[PDB]
Structure 1
Amino acid sequence: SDPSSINGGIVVAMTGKDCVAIACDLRLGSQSLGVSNKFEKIFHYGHVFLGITGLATDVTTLNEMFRYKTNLYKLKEERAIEPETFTQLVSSSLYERRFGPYFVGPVVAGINSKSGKPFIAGFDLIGCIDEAKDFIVSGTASDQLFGMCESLYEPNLEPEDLFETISQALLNAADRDALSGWGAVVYIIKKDEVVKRYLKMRQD
């Protein structure tokens, strides 16, 4: 009944030293029934990454919408959109459906190509920006993620250390949520290289 917890899933993003990380589980379900273990929730438009939790139809719809908008942005601006700018575009786009909203919990992650500054941001379903330096969490196990991130996180982690921290935050949070899991992906993002790692986890 609650649209934000029909399909399940989680996203988490973290900042490190000259890097950002964003991660998600791979589950899509119909309440108790597991449907897909390959439903990735992180997308990217150029060097800006967007994770989206919530109702899966809206996740797909919003990805297509932001691909649409970032492609036109690029054609007109003659440059790739930056994380700060994209964050405002997501906020704008969500609030325009104020009284008929997309049931989602988006998370932006990326590095500004000009300043080199790591950036993350989160949103509620109607566009309120959460602009936190450390970490952003979203999904049906957001409580679990807040707990994991608050205790595991420390600032200025190197890329390969940040990978371990965010991976353990996701994994152990997902294992305390019925509607999250069935696989996981972690993106480690640096100014001009991005590595994508699929994690091994329990499949129940």
Structure 2
Amino acid sequence: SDPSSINGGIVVAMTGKDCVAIACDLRLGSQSLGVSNKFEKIFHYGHVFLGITGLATDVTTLNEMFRYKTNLYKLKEERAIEPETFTQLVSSSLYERRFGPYFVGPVVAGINSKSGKPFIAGFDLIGCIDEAKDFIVSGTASDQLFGMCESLYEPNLEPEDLFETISQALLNAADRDALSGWGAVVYIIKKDEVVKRYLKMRQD
């Protein structure tokens, strides 16, 4: 019944030293039934990364919408959109459906190409921006993720250390959530290289 917990799923993002990380589980379900173990929830538009949790049809719809808008942005501006600017675009787009909203929990992550500054942001389903310094969490195991992140996280972690921290935050949160899991992906993002890693986890 609750649109935000029909399909299940989670997303988490973290900042590090001259880097950011964003990770998600791979489950898509119909309440108790697991349907897909390849439903990735992280997308990217140039160097800006967007993770979306919640109702799967809206996840897909919003990805297609932001691809649409960022491609036009680039044609007109003659440059790729930056994380700070994209964050405002997400907020604007969600609030235009104030009284008929997309049932989603978006998360933005990336590095500004000019300043080199790491950036993350989270939103509620209607556009409110949470621009955190440390981490952002979203999904059906957000309570679990808050507990993991708040204890495991420390500032200025190196990319390969940040990977371990965010991976363990996701994995152990997902293993205490019935509607999350069935695989996981982690993106490690630096100013001009991005690595993508699929994690091995329990498949129940």
TM-score band, normalised by the shorter chain? over 0.9
Runs of at least 4 residues off by over 6 Å: none
Residues 74-111 of structure 1 deviation map (CA, whole Å, 9 limit, x = unaligned): 00000000000000000000000000000000000000
Percentage of identical aligned residues? 100
* Superposed CA offset, 1:113-138 (max 9, x none): 00000000000000000010000000
Deviation digits for residues 5-38 of structure 1 (CA, Å, limit 9, x no counterpart): 0000000000000000000000000000000000
Deviation at 1:58, TM superposition (A): 0.1
Alignment deviations for residues 131-181 of structure 1 (CA, whole Å, 9 cap, x no partner): 100000000000000000000000000000000000000000000000000
Task: Count how many residue pairs are aligned between Structure 1 and Structure 2.
Answer: 204
Deviations 1:36-86 (A, max 9, x none): 000000000000000000000000000000000000000000000000000
Distance in 1, matches of 2:165 and 2:96, equals 36
What is the TM-score with the length of structure 2 in the denominator? 1.00
Give distance in 1, aligned partners of 2:94 and 2:191: 28
Any gaps of 5 or more consecutive residues in structure 2?
Answer: none
Q: List gaps (5 residues or longer) in structure 1.
A: none
Normalising by the residue count of structure 1, what TM-score does the alignment of the two structures yield? 1.00
d(CA) in 1 for partners of 2:70, 2:122: 18
1:171 is paired with a residue whose SS is helix
CA distance in 1, matches of 2:98, 2:79: 30
Partners of 2:175 and 2:92 lie apart in 1 by 34
Q: Please, what is the CA RMSD of the aligned residues?
A: 0.1
Which residue does 2:51 correspond to in 1? Answer: 51
1:194 aligns with 2:166: no
